[PDB]
């Protein structure tokens, strides 16, 4: 049926890399492809065929593993809240900045528009952190800014009449759910050269764009936990638009909410004793 | 109910899964997409942009100066300016460039690379330079006589400030390994050598600076690609960021 | 696609209501490298001298 | 026939250079006004025209032997200047592009190279989160302390991904960049957010054919382009 | 049986699921739908209805009197009648209105708002009033000279008892955050100021009441919407109801 | 096939918000859109374009998150009966009034016609309420008015020949089932200005409309429980018709079966010291 | 041309006002008879016509300085009045709409504002569940004790969602509301259930151009509209 | 719907017999705000004076 | 295998379920239906007596 045709999108990865045309020797004063001028800011236009004698090469290699979708389109850890047994409650602030691998991958772009698939793995363990048996339901509640936060395991906030929740078992399959692009802005921002507030220039609000922050995930067990639970929160970025590539992060990350780095030794690649030998 | 047989792989979570999954906010209607300049659809658009090699990686050089290879007035003929093992992996000068940092995220590479050099001496400073690419099998070329036997360009300093040496994809196989993993003998994928030589000399008027610089720049050609995502070696953490 | 060479051909079937539920997009989209490599008012053809 | 000679006429103001390289147009995107499909603010914008879309010259900088570089936030650097500055003060939100012209002449007896970066959303840090005098330095601009790291934990070498030109003294004495508006929203406040940073970083140091080092200034000239303003109220000068 | 692979999210219960589920009474046939007046299909039909602002929120005012802003005969020129931070969230006067109580259930908002004011003085009581909307960036306007620089209407008391100040959607972004969550810096979404001033004065015949009232009313325009349901802050319980 | 076409309904959320037309200045005595009269009971008709000079804005925002279906169309807690080990039996009286979030959401309307999806999560715990292991079937029996109630865990009422029952496992996936609109009336009533009975005006039967009450859910374990079981009963309202919007509840709820409130301090929004400053 | 002058003629009765605002027609729905598709009761209804569809005037109320408000249940308030009252007493079930007219004149030397609510299904409470003398107060009506909470734990400010008019003494001396039948069933008992509540609440207090406060009454006039009755038996007056 | 903008387009597929089993309805239904905002016998056009 | 997501209500037994279920005697062929007087299709035929 055509109605089911609406739920199917045929999508194709068949873009190839550029090929090579055979070329011959050139002795002239007409064509000088090797002479360049980096001052313009343009990258060199010279190609293989104009610099040496080439054979013909039919293109066969795909480019799809470096499409922005493929590069971001896998799951990565973004949150690891620990539910202790004293209160049986925990939360994770929602952003991709606690764990460095996804953050550094995002640092190649300025603005990014995407959806998210979240995946939550819960693991129970003892005080000495050895795996242990515990079968219990847990509740993950999305708490958006301005909604009252639960303060206990039995708080009546966990009613969840308006906050969305997911209920799953600690020893069941992983909870998984998708999320549309939720920013009030038309993209997310990986970096922000401004202040979070008018009438304020506190350093702690520099580089803080609050339209990236959609709130909190809160976690309880539905009864009081017998053992601590660790939730691992994975995000896969999908349906991805990217704008304005950047110099990628090179210094290690130090803080969650700013770009501070050490910068004690100004170098990235390793040293050698002489430029004319390895 | 429809009879079924769940098989192996049931209830597993693979990080590269391509599956639909229920939306926790199925009534949400996002903000429109607006026009923004510079939309990127494929990271090989970035890899084709030139970036500066951290080429002056000599022990003791710090900061911006690591980006300028010294070039001097020579008192002897046919001297060497620079030497560089052609490698997208490892930790040498190519590893910190745009192409090198993308290669840190990938396991395999193919295609031609170009190196654009810009001379920074005074208007009155002259010189001719030989830029050589030696395919693998042996060592770095020891003298300009040996290096010239390879692919090479000869650069005349003048109004057009810059030159390109295209390092063409010359290779037994369709792809090479990015890394130089020793236990796995990925030196099998040795990709050759780049060396720079004085073709004549750097010549100056009396009392000019007797030392100038080359800024080396590198980028991928349109026939280039990467395979197999892999974790970046030097982007680590010992603790959760707070 | 039971295989052409480097052509992955996929029928993304979304079972849920919201487009955000769909799996990741496998299309290759247009590449305009020259907005980043040749970002200059006057085109410089390869065989010409760049300055002047 | 000659991309070494340029003339830029905006408003009542005209720049010339006899040693340009070319003109960089960032992301191949000439500045353009906001279309009805992307716009959200319902009030009718003020478009000041030539009263603001004109070149403004900042104070010059001496290129010294030890110079690490200089930077300016936009619109920040022009927020107190002319009718651009006044339109930016009197409105809640602003949008527009830039025409940037960096001047530095020296002799055929000099050597040295400047890198001229226009960096969008250039959030900066060092070993510490920066204060207001560095995030929004005004017309006088700021200076780099970590030019190798581009003040942001990235690298200067990879910043050629950003729109740029060089000033290599053997070749040219000026760099020109045309910048479109870049943001994740249609308009944004001029006092709270800097959409672009103009960064001028010495890469090859400045050397003279003698040991006596005369004064070689760097001079920045910036024209706003295709500007709109919405949200008229009293004039507010800074985010403090 | 058909081979299957149950994946992640198996057996979870999401409160926003959109799935069919077996009916425990599959033969039941409900009563017909009859006509009832006032069917509502969308809660923005309610948000476009005017409601009264709890505008006189001064400490010590209780009950119905919180709905009437005092307006008096002034002995000085250009005095201020009222000041109000434009906010759908928080706990100020807009928060208890129909629009404000709907905003308590949502995280984000967009669109124009209108404020309708009704004067309640005697037939013989005259006056002119300035109603101002100041876009964000600074503080509340300090004097009528500063407030007039913004969007504003000037109200003449007369036969038509009421006036509208339309507060238009003036905004850097397509949407704002409803809440003023401090830890999350949602003051980023500051939406400006509404102030009321004497444009001339309230003037009365001898021995009339020297004080009268404005009843402020608020509603959404047809270009308004809400996103992201969220829990209402002030609808709580400490125990199950019995 | 067309028969399967009967089981598919293509349904679309594409209603947009109103746009904006550009306008210019008006100097006249003809058109006075800003002059209003709130006495009529009509809301102001004045629009943006007639009050200031506007630009043109193409509408892009949807309205679907405030459709009555979307606003009610999620699950919320409505019942939390506890099955003790002494009798292994419990029940929940069926109405949406024990937990305040759903009740307050319903208080925006007078009459509501809907279906229900019920979801039941069972959790076992110790006497000190710590999660514990217990695998057992439980039975939820719908007991409509006039059907005899079970008095024990082994009562022969649990035969369930005519009452519908659901059997599920305490440590299995949650039981879930749908329900059509069951009222004898043509809608449910959120509020009732009348008496439950003729010939009676007892205050305890004021505001009681017994056509909202469809009876009881009764709960046992199929054997005698070793640990207490807590059932959490969630309801999602769907296929929703709503009539006659109301002033929503503002005072906290106090009782399950009437609208009694404290009303000690007559105010809702917070106070300030002066009307001309914040 | 003038919505300040109105005339309402039902039966043998006619109202006029020279200061109306307009006429509120609740939910835009004029009262209408029950169609065969929604009806359930099989007996042929009695439709009394003009004998009951006519204006009835209740006793007037003084507007005092301290007045919190007044309220009447419908049909409750008219259940002992005229042939409406008799038809409602003699039948088990009843249906119909209302034409409500609130009168209050004062001078151009007075100020004050009444809110005139028609509230459907107005179930009331306070700190306690109310007794019969408040839930069904009869022709004399009841008084508010929590006018801020609208006797029901909601708020007076949000009750403009209900059909309403104002009586603002500078503008008008009368409010008119036309009410359709509202219920979740087709017909319902007149003695057991009140479909509408007429509520008149002072918002701006009553002030005079002197300190001597003459008598300013409020007067309610209500006409049933499009009435039907089914289930004829003996006459039953109240649910007690 | 693999995407138009703010158009969610859903094929609700009910697997059970009773209509009550079906998932929630995603249609946008007609809005008549004026039964609540303009509930008056005589229409008052925006440009007119309301009274008289 | 076809990717699936079993949801809530998995493995429950509802007494009013309307589902097909495997026949323990799939080859059985019942005796024909004969005519019998007084066939009842709906219990409201009894209620009208
Ligand atoms: C739990 C359902 C709603 C949660 C919304 C999650 C959306 C996350 C997007 C994060 C984008 C900003 C990333 C960052 O700031 O580093
Ligand atoms: C339950 C309905 C069954 C429909 C699924 C049919 C199989 C999925 C289509 C996969 C299309 C791409 C596969 C390929 O050719 O590589
Ligand atoms: C267990 C199967 C039959 C149960 C019927 C449940 C129907 C619940 C509808 C409740 C509507 C009235 C809500 C209320 O009174 O507050
Ligand atoms: C087992 C029979 C398979 C039929 C299900 C096909 C997929 C469900 C249709 C979903 C339609 C709306 C999806 C969308 O376009 O957003």
Coordinates of N, CA and C in Angstrom, one line a residue, chain D residues 136-202:
Chain D
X136 N 35.1 40.3 25.8 CA 34.5 41.4 25.1 C 35.4 42.6 25.2
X137 N 36.6 42.6 24.6 CA 37.6 43.6 24.8 C 37.3 45.0 24.2
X138 N 36.3 45.1 23.4 CA 35.9 46.4 22.8 C 36.7 46.8 21.6
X139 N 36.7 48.1 21.3 CA 37.4 48.6 20.1 C 38.9 48.3 20.1
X140 N 39.5 48.4 21.3 CA 41.0 48.2 21.4 C 41.4 46.7 21.2
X141 N 40.4 45.8 21.2 CA 40.7 44.4 21.1 C 41.6 43.8 22.2
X142 N 41.8 42.5 22.2 CA 42.6 41.8 23.1 C 43.8 41.2 22.4
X143 N 44.7 40.5 23.2 CA 45.9 39.9 22.7 C 45.8 38.4 23.1
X144 N 46.4 37.6 22.2 CA 46.6 36.2 22.5 C 47.6 36.0 23.6
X145 N 47.4 34.9 24.5 CA 48.4 34.4 25.3 C 48.8 33.0 25.0
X146 N 47.9 32.2 24.3 CA 48.2 30.9 23.8 C 48.0 30.9 22.3
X147 N 48.7 31.6 21.6 CA 48.5 31.6 20.1 C 48.6 30.2 19.5
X148 N 49.5 29.4 20.0 CA 49.6 28.0 19.5 C 48.3 27.2 19.7
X149 N 47.6 27.4 20.8 CA 46.3 26.7 21.0 C 45.1 27.5 20.5
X150 N 45.3 28.6 19.9 CA 44.2 29.5 19.4 C 43.3 29.9 20.5
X151 N 43.8 30.1 21.7 CA 43.1 30.5 22.9 C 42.0 29.6 23.3
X152 N 41.9 28.4 22.7 CA 40.7 27.6 22.9 C 41.0 26.1 23.0
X153 N 42.3 25.7 23.3 CA 42.6 24.3 23.3 C 42.6 23.5 22.0
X154 N 42.4 24.2 20.9 CA 42.6 23.6 19.6 C 44.0 23.9 19.1
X155 N 44.3 24.0 17.8 CA 45.6 24.3 17.4 C 45.5 25.4 16.3
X156 N 46.5 26.3 16.3 CA 46.6 27.3 15.2 C 46.8 26.7 13.9
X157 N 47.5 25.6 13.8 CA 47.8 24.9 12.5 C 46.5 24.5 11.8
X158 N 45.5 24.0 12.6 CA 44.3 23.5 12.0 C 43.3 24.7 11.8
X159 N 43.6 25.9 12.3 CA 42.6 27.0 12.1 C 42.5 27.4 10.6
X160 N 43.2 26.8 9.7 CA 42.9 27.2 8.3 C 41.6 26.7 7.8
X161 N 40.9 25.8 8.6 CA 39.5 25.5 8.3 C 38.7 26.7 8.4
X162 N 39.0 27.7 9.2 CA 38.3 28.9 9.3 C 38.6 29.8 8.1
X163 N 37.7 30.7 7.7 CA 38.0 31.7 6.6 C 39.2 32.5 7.0
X164 N 40.1 32.7 6.0 CA 41.4 33.3 6.4 C 42.0 33.8 5.1
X165 N 43.0 34.7 5.3 CA 44.1 35.0 4.3 C 45.4 35.1 5.1
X166 N 46.5 35.2 4.3 CA 47.7 35.5 4.9 C 48.1 37.0 4.5
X167 N 48.9 37.6 5.4 CA 49.7 38.7 4.9 C 51.2 38.2 5.1
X168 N 51.7 37.8 3.9 CA 53.1 37.5 3.8 C 53.8 38.7 3.1
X169 N 54.7 39.3 3.9 CA 55.2 40.7 3.5 C 55.9 40.7 2.1
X170 N 56.5 39.6 1.7 CA 57.0 39.5 0.3 C 56.0 39.6 -0.8
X171 N 54.7 39.3 -0.5 CA 53.6 39.2 -1.4 C 52.6 40.3 -1.4
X172 N 52.0 40.5 -0.2 CA 50.8 41.4 -0.1 C 51.0 42.2 1.2
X173 N 50.2 43.3 1.2 CA 50.2 44.2 2.4 C 48.8 44.3 3.0
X174 N 47.8 43.5 2.5 CA 46.5 43.6 3.0 C 45.7 42.3 2.8
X175 N 44.8 42.0 3.7 CA 43.8 40.9 3.6 C 42.4 41.4 3.7
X176 N 41.5 40.9 2.9 CA 40.1 41.2 2.8 C 39.3 40.0 3.0
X177 N 38.3 40.1 4.0 CA 37.4 39.0 4.2 C 36.0 39.5 4.2
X178 N 35.1 38.9 3.5 CA 33.7 39.1 3.6 C 33.0 38.0 4.4
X179 N 32.3 38.3 5.4 CA 31.8 37.4 6.4 C 30.2 37.4 6.4
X180 N 29.6 36.3 6.1 CA 28.1 36.2 6.3 C 27.8 36.2 7.8
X181 N 26.6 36.5 8.1 CA 26.1 36.3 9.5 C 26.1 34.8 9.8
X182 N 26.7 34.4 10.9 CA 26.6 33.0 11.3 C 26.1 32.9 12.8
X183 N 25.1 32.1 13.0 CA 24.4 31.9 14.3 C 23.5 30.6 14.1
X184 N 23.2 30.1 15.3 CA 22.2 29.0 15.3 C 20.7 29.6 15.4
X185 N 20.5 30.9 15.6 CA 19.2 31.5 15.6 C 19.2 32.6 14.5
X186 N 18.0 33.2 14.1 CA 18.0 34.2 13.1 C 18.6 35.5 13.5
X187 N 18.3 36.1 14.6 CA 19.0 37.3 15.1 C 19.5 37.0 16.5
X188 N 20.3 37.9 17.1 CA 20.8 37.7 18.4 C 21.3 39.1 18.9
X189 N 21.4 39.2 20.2 CA 21.9 40.4 20.9 C 23.3 40.7 20.6
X190 N 23.6 42.0 20.3 CA 24.9 42.5 20.0 C 25.8 42.6 21.2
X191 N 25.2 42.8 22.4 CA 26.0 43.0 23.6 C 26.2 41.7 24.4
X192 N 25.5 40.7 24.1 CA 25.6 39.5 24.9 C 26.4 38.4 24.2
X193 N 26.5 38.4 22.8 CA 27.1 37.4 22.0 C 27.9 37.9 20.9
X194 N 29.1 37.3 20.7 CA 30.0 37.7 19.6 C 29.9 36.6 18.5
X195 N 29.4 36.9 17.3 CA 29.3 35.9 16.3 C 30.6 35.6 15.6
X196 N 31.5 36.5 15.4 CA 32.8 36.4 14.8 C 33.9 36.9 15.7
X197 N 35.1 36.4 15.5 CA 36.3 37.0 16.1 C 37.3 37.2 14.9
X198 N 37.8 38.4 14.8 CA 38.9 38.7 13.9 C 40.2 38.5 14.6
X199 N 41.0 37.5 14.2 CA 42.3 37.2 14.8 C 43.4 37.4 13.8
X200 N 44.4 38.1 14.3 CA 45.6 38.3 13.5 C 46.8 37.8 14.3
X201 N 47.4 36.7 13.8 CA 48.5 36.0 14.6 C 49.8 36.0 13.7
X202 N 50.9 36.5 14.3 CA 52.2 36.4 13.6 C 52.6 34.9 13.6

